[PDB]
């Protein structure tokens, strides 16, 4: 395992503001692209502030479709739920997060990411592969609104892999007023061989706001997000 002498482990690494670096390499129907992101996370408040840039030119998919792929260790876990925080418990060695995201009546993304500390920086390194998309559909045809809605993300233990399974749905807004469903199937597994916290069933409550940097001429996304764990509740 880790050196114990190690000063901070698991949740101890998140008591303050932590710098975040995100790196994504993607290929959707052979459209290749890369995204980098930077900012900070303050788990005490469940607060994420991040700016992402497409480093290869124009992003060939809508930015909103990448939000879930682009650090659940920054969730605010209530003190009364702290024993259910898998994500921080896996740190600093980290965890692998894998998803399949099914876009209804369109293609799918498959993603694999490793989330771990490199010194003081929490790093999310991702590979994304998309296939079976319609060239003129809502994704490759860029028919989605640049916005986001609030969601619950449902977490349960996966004892076989010493990890968790996560499931949720995102409904992106199409420019004609309709909805593009993106059904998310997710699993996380620790990278290290030490103990992790395997949670009871619960959820994370997300709020997300997308904006633009008026001084940024590259294709980019500014993201402000708040994340709180809930769903496990006589004192009063
Ligand atoms: Cl976009
Ligand atoms: Cl997150
Ligand atoms: Cl928004």
Question: Any key phrases for this structure?
Answer:
11 strands, photoprotein, 2% helix, chromophore, 1 helix, 11-stranded mixed barrel, mainly beta, 236 residues, Green fluorescent protein, Green Fluorescent Protein, luminescence, binds chloride ion
Please provide a written account of the structure.
The protein has one domain: Green Fluorescent Protein. It has an 11-stranded mixed beta barrel with strand order 1-2-3-11-10-7-8-9-4-5-6. It is mostly beta strands. The radius of gyration is 18 Å and the shape is globular. Strand 8 and strand 9 form a beta hairpin. The site of one chloride ion has 3 residues, from loops. One chloride ion binds next to loops. The PDB classes it as luminescent protein.
Write the layout of secondary structure elements.
Blueprint: E1 17-28, E2 31-42, E3 47-54, H1 86-89, E4 95-103, E5 108-118, E6 121-131, E7 151-158, E8 163-173, E9 179-190, E10 202-211, E11 220-230
Parallel strand pairs: 1-6
Antiparallel strand pairs: 1-2, 2-3, 3-11, 4-5, 4-9, 5-6, 7-8, 7-10, 8-9, 10-11
**Number of helical segments with 4 or more residues:** 1
Look up the CATH topology.
Answer: Green Fluorescent Protein
What is the domain total for the residues?
Answer: 1
Find the structural class using helix and strand composition.
mainly beta
The best one-word shape is globular
PDB class: luminescent protein
Keywords: luminescence, green fluorescent protein, GFP, E2, bioluminescence, photoactive protein, fluorescent chloride, bromide, iodine, halogen, luminescent protein
Assembly: monomeric
Entry title: Spectroscopic and Structural Study of the Heterotropic Linkage between Halide and Proton Ion Binding to Gfp Proteins: E2(GFP)-Cl Complex
